């Protein structure tokens, strides 16, 4: 529901909703990134 994205320029967190035009509310910058998942992740140290 929240869908926090990190803006490329200002590196700011911000919610984005579906159908919402992609634009950082803070800097008007159109490139964002999904935050690292919360799922459990493991790596055998091989």
């Amino acid at each position: 529901q929240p869908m926090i994205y990190i803006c490329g320029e200002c590196h700011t967190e911000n919610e984005i909703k579906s159908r919402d035009p992609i634009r950082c509310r803070e800097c008007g910058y159109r490139i964002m990134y999904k935050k690292r998942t919360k799922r459990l992740v493991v790596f055998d140290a091989r």
């Binding site: 200002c10 590196h11 700011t12 950082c24 008007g28």
Partner: protein
């Protein structure tokens, strides 16, 4: 928004620290007017900035 003829960063007269505001002179008046609406609210270096035509020498009775 357009080519910049000159850029002026104001500094403290005695302390020398950056004031935080500057005057930008574009080559064409239209480039300025094009920037008036879009520039206001921009984010430079993580801090929001506002932009309005400098009225210090345009608006009568401005200070």
């Amino acid at each position: 928004y357009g080519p910049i003829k000159r850029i002026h960063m104001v500094y403290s007269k005695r302390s020398g620290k950056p004031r935080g505001y500057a005057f930008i002179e574009y080559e064409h008046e239209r480039d300025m007017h094009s920037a008036y609406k879009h520039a206001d609210g921009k984010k430079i270096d993580g801090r929001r900035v506002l932009v309005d035509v400098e009225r210090g020498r345009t608006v009568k009775g401005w200070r």
